[PDB]
Design a protein around this ligand. Structure first.
Ligand SMILES: *[C@@H]1O[C@H](CO)[C@@H](O[C@@H]2O[C@H](CO)[C@@H](O[C@@H]3O[C@H](CO[C@H]4O[C@H](CO)[C@@H](O)[C@H](O[C@H]5O[C@H](CO)[C@@H](O)[C@H](O)[C@@H]5O[C@H]5O[C@H](CO)[C@@H](O)[C@H](O)[C@@H]5O)[C@@H]4O)[C@@H](O)[C@H](O)[C@@H]3O)[C@H](O)[C@H]2NC(C)=O)[C@H](O)[C@H]1NC(C)=O
Ligand SMILES: CNC(=O)C[C@@H](NC(=O)Cn1cnc2ccc(N3CCN(C(C)=O)CC3)cc2c1=O)c1ccc([N+](=O)[O-])cc1
Ligand SMILES: [Ca+2]
Ligand SMILES: [Ca+2]
Ligand SMILES: [Cl-]
Ligand SMILES: [K+]
Ligand code: NA
Ligand SMILES: [Zn+2]
Length: 800
């Protein structure tokens, strides 16, 4: 029982049990008794009217229209408009902000993050007639057509990602609700457990800023502080003296999410919440202008996720699938997470639950996954709060445990689904001296903003999942100049060193069936004469310590690892006019030793013969060889990789059918393909002592995934091998699995399911980099910033 007089919304939290007056005291029930009275005034609303102009100051009012209000910094945001003949910010023409236009004493342009909830990307077009303030920021500043959220596309995972640059698996906020089995505790959007710091990892922007001497309070706000008071509080803090005034601010809205859940993303009821949000942006913008800061402050208008049509009747029930549904706990809704109801149960079987949920109903509106089998693009596995069993739920559907969980309809909207889904996409607009003027930028991921916000504030970012430099094109002036990571391992270039009779690999090939214009041509090819043709962007750099060989061939070049006994990468180009052939019958099972590489660093056919589960495929496909003579190169033991027969069905369709179709559609393609090892599902390259599976009785390690990166010219009138402008890329990371249980239609012809599987497993080049320790596109004519943007690109396969 102290007092909040003169202390209203103090930035520093005061020591217990002395009462608090900061923006969080209400959450902790620890405000002074007069907090409401002094700090949450509402009298007379939030607008000046003419009759108030030059009033005698009445300290009980929510805001002021008295002559002294500018000096005090507590005018209603519309004061100068209603009482001084001034115009609303939205009514001013927009004028380029070439330099920061800040009052004396401002050391840097302030950053204000304006965060909207459930603000679906398409609201920017569809709601344009009712959001004039937001439409002005959008067209005058720098904007993307949409921004991709993290998965799950829920509120808390995304807001903390925005603040950290980290995937939820890394920052720890992996859901709106979660259970930590080490804490034996549950975090919920509502309640006080979330106040415990033990849930929150990484280093949020306000901590980064503080550690480096830039003032910034926490971004959290007590729920019962309304939005008009939040704006007035930011505007007040902006009037503090230089030595006390923060440089970063965050405002968060409950809308349009609150209404969208009730009404659907496009319910007629949705127009008003969009109007109210625009009005709030108007208030902030008029207030900034009153403080002469509207050409000084950088403003970020950003959403956390979109919103989809979802109703009670579109719910799948696990009780329709599982006989023993009471033995599980489900995190339900737009995603599913399943764990044992009771830990003291060795009669709980994840494999049997998964099998009972797999392809059981023809139209089944969810798919089960062990978390490590989820598409790697989701980066959703490496945290103990993520249950081993995950259900990816179709857009527009829910999953629930039992029917009484849903009837004990409330809602018409929800969000949470896979982050590639169009309806889950959200918004980004940057406006201010440091952002560009009237500029559209390509869609990008919210994990990249932490770095940009650090650049906006002169800060060195904490280590995070953004790729710093990838968003330099948003900025008029950047403090960050990216440079390529240095190569750690230089390759060996072996010559012909071994005779055939030194190998005992138990391999066979029909190849003895045997000119100097042609023979000199074949040795030129083994020495890299065609390398300009098949390695278009230089060779990848190896960023870790290892031993490997560059191997040249007429059709493909490779980086062959002597430690993993297989290529780390295989690079080749297939022109639009290139032709597909078959494997001649006499070479069906041909494998040939490579006289450049020792028996001791080679795979062997015997292991594959003995391993009754594991077969093999090739990284450069025999099917695409340029000539009957070159085809022999494709059967080298150095081009071979371990592959489950079930996976060979996928890979063979990709190599025999899809590669050629891409070359026809894209006017040639360059392909880089290779294995990935990620047994501990942390998204990062495994070292050799982390490998859990080998081909039986050998040291040949088994990949968890195979990747390919597929590059051509953005201008497809030019061929892939003669491109002088920007590049186009799509990539995938395919799980290397011994069954096709993921694909419910896999009994059918590959043309009915393979491409669908690959699209699900689409990836950024940067994801493959993390997973292999390789750095691509080292030698192009493109700027490094442009290449970094290319490496973060995801081909989504969604409609427009
Ligand atoms: C996305 O970007 C992040 C950030 O760069 C990368 O994460 C880093 O990975 C490296 C290599 O695996 C880790 O290094 C290890 O660090 C530990 C000591 O770790 C402690 O100290 C660090 C640094 O101050 C701290 O950040 C760590 O925080 C983890 O654990 C906390 C509590 O246990 C938790 O609150 C927090 O969320 C975080 O959890 C996550 O990471 C851990 C692994 O560290 C993991 O078990 C957990 O499930 C979560 O995923 C920690 O207290 C050394 O002893 C090791 O030898 C090793 O050097 C970094 O710790 C790690 N940092 C963070 C913030 O996660 C990702 O790899 C990158 N992803 C991709 C795909 O590139
Ligand atoms: C309209 N929407 C909003 O206002 C969104 C806003 N919601 C809240 O702040 C709701 N709330 C209310 N009182 C709290 C009191 C204490 C805490 N702990 C958390 C852990 N601590 C740390 C880590 O410092 C100490 C403080 C949290 C809260 C809290 O979440 C929000 C902003 C940023 C982020 N974000 O994730 O960045 C998430 C959530
Ligand atoms: Ca939200
Ligand atoms: Ca790993
Ligand atoms: Cl959740
Ligand atoms: K076999
Ligand atoms: Na199947
Ligand atoms: Zn919501």
């Amino acid at each position: 029982s102290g007092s909040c007089k003169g202390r209203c919304f103090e930035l520093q939290e005061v020591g217990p049990p002395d009462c608090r007056c900061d923006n969080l005291c209400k959450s902790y029930s620890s405000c002074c008794h007069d907090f409401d009275e002094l700090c949450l005034k509402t009298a007379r609303g939030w607008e000046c009217t003419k009759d108030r102009c030059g009033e005698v100051r009445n300290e009980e009012n929510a805001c002021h229209c008295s002559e002294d209000c500018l000096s005090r910094g507590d005018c209603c945001t519309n004061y100068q408009v209603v009482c001084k003949g001034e115009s609303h910010w939205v009514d001013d023409d927009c004028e380029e902000i070439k330099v920061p236009e800040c009052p004396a004493g401002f050391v840097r342009p302030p950053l204000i993050i304006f965060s909207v909830d459930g603000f679906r990307a398409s609201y920017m077009k569809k709601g344009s007639k009712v959001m004039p303030n937001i439409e002005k920021l959008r067209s005058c500043g720098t904007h993307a057509p949409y921004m991709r959220p993290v998965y799950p596309t829920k509120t808390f995972p995304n807001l903390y990602t925005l603040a950290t640059g980290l995937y939820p698996e890394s920052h720890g906020i992996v859901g709106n609700s979660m259970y930590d089995p080490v804490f034996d505790a549950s975090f919920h959007l509502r309640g006080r457990e979330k106040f415990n710091h033990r849930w929150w990892g990484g280093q949020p922007l306000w901590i980064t800023a503080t550690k480096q001497g830039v003032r910034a309070g926490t971004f959290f706000w007590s729920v019962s502080i309304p939005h008009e008071r939040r704006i007035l509080t930011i505007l007040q803090w902006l009037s503090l003296p230089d030595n006390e005034r923060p440089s970063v601010y965050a405002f968060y809205s409950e809308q349009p999410d609150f209404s969208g859940h009730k009404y659907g993303p496009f319910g007629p009821e949705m127009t008003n919440p969009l109007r109210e949000i625009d009005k709030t942006v108007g208030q902030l913008m008029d207030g900034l202008k009153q403080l002469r800061l509207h050409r000084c402050v950088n403003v970020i208008f950003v959403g956390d996720h979109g919103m989809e049509d979802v109703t009670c009747d579109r719910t799948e029930f696990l009780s329709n699938y599982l006989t023993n549904v009471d033995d599980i706990t489900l995190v339900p809704g737009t995603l599913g997470r399943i764990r044992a109801k009771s830990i003291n149960n060795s009669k709980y079987d994840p494999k049997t639950i998964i099998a009972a949920l797999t392809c059981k109903k023809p139209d089944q509106h969810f798919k089960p996954y062990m978390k490590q089998h989820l598409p790697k693009r989701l980066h959703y596995a490496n945290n103990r709060r993520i249950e081993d069993i995950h259900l990816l739920v179709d857009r527009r559907w829910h999953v629930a445990r039992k029917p009484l969980d849903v009837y004990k309809c409330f809602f018409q909207g929800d969000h949470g689904f896979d982050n590639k889904v169009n309806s889950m996409q959200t918004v980004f607009v940057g406006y201010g001296p440091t952002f560009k003027y009237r500029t559209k930028v390509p869609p990008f991921e919210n994990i990249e903003l932490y770095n940009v916000m650090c650049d906006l504030l002169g800060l060195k970012p904490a280590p995070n999942n953004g790729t710093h430099g990838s968003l330099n094109h948003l900025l008029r002036t950047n403090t960050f100049r990216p440079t390529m990571p240095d190569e750690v391992s230089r390759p060996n270039y072996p010559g012909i060193m071994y005779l055939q009779s030194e190998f005992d690999l138990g391999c066979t090939c029909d190849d003895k069936v045997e000119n100097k214009l042609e023979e000199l041509n074949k040795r030129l090819h083994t020495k890299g004469s065609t390398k300009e043709r098949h390695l278009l962007y230089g060779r990848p750099a190896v960023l870790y310590r290892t031993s490997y060989d560059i191997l040249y061939h007429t059709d493909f070049e490779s980086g062959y690892s002597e430690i993993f006994l297989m290529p780390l990468w295989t690079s080749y180009t297939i022109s639009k006019q290139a032709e597909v052939s078959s494997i001649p019958e006499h070479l069906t099972n041909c494998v040939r030793p490579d006289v450049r590489v020792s028996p001791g660093f080679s795979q062997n056919c015997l292991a594959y013969k003995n391993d009754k589960q594991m077969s093999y495929g090739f990284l450069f496909p025999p099917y695409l060889s340029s000539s009957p003579e070159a085809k022999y190169d494709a059967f080298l033991v150095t081009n071979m990789v371990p592959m489950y027969p079930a996976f060979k069905r996928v890979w063979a369709y990709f190599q025999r059918v899809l590669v050629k179709k891409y070359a026809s559609e894209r006017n040639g393609v360059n392909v880089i393909s290779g294995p990935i090892f990620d047994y501990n599902y942390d998204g990062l390259r495994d070292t050799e002592d982390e490998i859990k599976q080998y081909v039986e009785g050998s040291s040949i390690p088994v990949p968890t995934h195979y990747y390919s990166i597929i590059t051509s010219c953005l201008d497809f009138t030019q061929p892939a091998d003669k491109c002088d402008g920007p590049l186009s890329v799509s990539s995938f990371i395919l799980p290397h699995r011994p069954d096709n249980d993921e694909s419910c239609n896999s009994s059918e012809d590959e043309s009915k399911w393979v491409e669908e599987l690959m699209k699900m497993h689409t990836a950024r080049v940067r994801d493959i980099e993390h997973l292999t320790g390789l750095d691509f596109y080292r030698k192009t004519s493109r700027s490094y910033s442009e290449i970094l943007t290319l490496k973060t690109y995801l081909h989504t396969y969604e409609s427009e």
